[PDB]
């Protein structure tokens, strides 16, 4: 009792920070994603909708071979057509919201490319291991 | 048909056994965790509550880098302040319920320490791999 408090990394309050700086608080929001006869049914429906959204996101992460990891590198090359820029100005000057706004157009093709690369990698690994 | 039966590792009936002996039956209880307009709604709400509880537990396991594993070692040191004891008397003399009763006070700090260690390990691994 000397004036201490909590000073905990909370909600999206760090969204205004830079890319790399905001990468600190990914897990707290990930945990928050599961915060917890005419009105109870509606609130239950909202809860179930949140559950399906999170589970679909987890399924998408697992399909790309990144289950259980907040950060997971992939074998898909980063084509410069989407947004060339450079590494220095991305992780130190631009925020997450601006990046999402910029790259909102080509998200589906990225998802498909990650899917195809992960499937090919899984089959190649299975064949290589069966070879041994 | 010579008098055989089932003799299956069932419910918590092994809870009274020792720590290591009871570690055999973790998966059966883990599977049991998902056993399966005024009354149907209530039973559906109970089912959905169980689903959220299990999914939150899985999310907590994944956040600490232990997804998909019943047993997962971690890099957090075991401070002796919580309960010194020693290894021999823990896994051979004390039951799981007694251990939970003893360590019920400091669970949240353990969860936070595992979270922080896993996040730091993930970032260090990402930097090391990007170095190569």
């Amino acid at each position: 009792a000397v004036g201490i408090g909590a000073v905990f990394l909370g909600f999206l309050g760090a969204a205004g920070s830079t890319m790399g700086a905001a990468s600190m608080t990914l897990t707290v929001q990930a945990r928050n994603l599961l915060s917890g006869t005419v009105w109870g049914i509606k609130q239950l429906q909202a809860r179930v909708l949140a559950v399906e959204r999170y589970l679909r996101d987890q399924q998408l992460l697992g399909i790309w071979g990144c289950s259980g990891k907040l950060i997971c590198c992939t074998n898909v090359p980063w084509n410069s057509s989407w947004s060339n820029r450079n590494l220095s100005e991305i992780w130190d000057n631009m925020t997450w919201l601006q990046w999402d706004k910029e790259i909102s157009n080509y998200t589906q093709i990225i998802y498909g490319l990650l899917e195809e690369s992960q499937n090919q990698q899984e089959k190649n690994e299975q064949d290589l291991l069966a070879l041994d | 048909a010579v008098g055989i039966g089932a003799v299956f590792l069932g419910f918590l009936g092994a809870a009274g056994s020792t720590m290591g002996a009871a570690s055999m039956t973790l998966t059966v209880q883990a599977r049991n965790l998902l056993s399966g307009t005024v009354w149907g709604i209530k039973q559906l709400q109970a089912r959905v509550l169980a689903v959220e509880r299990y999914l939150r537990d899985q999310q907590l396991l994944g956040i600490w880098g232990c997804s998909g594993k019943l047993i997962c070692c971690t890099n957090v040191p075991w401070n002796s302040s919580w309960s010194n004891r020693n290894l021999s008397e823990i896994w051979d003399n004390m039951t799981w319920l007694q251990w939970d009763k003893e360590i019920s006070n400091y669970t949240q700090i353990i969860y936070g320490l595992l979270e922080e260690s896993q996040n730091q390990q993930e970032k260090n691994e990402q930097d090391l791999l990007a170095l190569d």
């Epitope: 000397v2 004036g3 201490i4 408090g5 909590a6 000073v7 905990f8 990394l9 909370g10 909600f11 309050g13 760090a14 920070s17 700086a21 600190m24 608080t25 | 700090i109 936070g112 320490l113």
Partner: nanobody, 122 residues
Amino acid sequence: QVQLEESGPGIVKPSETLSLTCAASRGPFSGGHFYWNWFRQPPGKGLEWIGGIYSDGDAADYNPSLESRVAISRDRSANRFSLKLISVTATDTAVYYCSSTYSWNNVWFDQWGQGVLVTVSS
């Protein structure tokens, strides 16, 4: 990652009002309580505690020997906090520090800064 800078008059005449101001920073932490504290380090002796204020409240704590002479206020719009000392004497010549201590889970960080020299003379 909080860096605290001190500002104020270098020389204050005796029995005058000494006003110092420091910039409060929150760092990567988004929510919690920050205890902005004012200290002083007179030359030739150890550090001394003047007072402190919470980030989420206007309540102020002061050293018992300086209750009637020390006041601390804050302005959130500028994210500053000021310390006013009245009836300044020769013993008030010190290096005044504005410090903030984090309170993350069972760590208890602490940041002080560089301080500012204040001299009392006529």
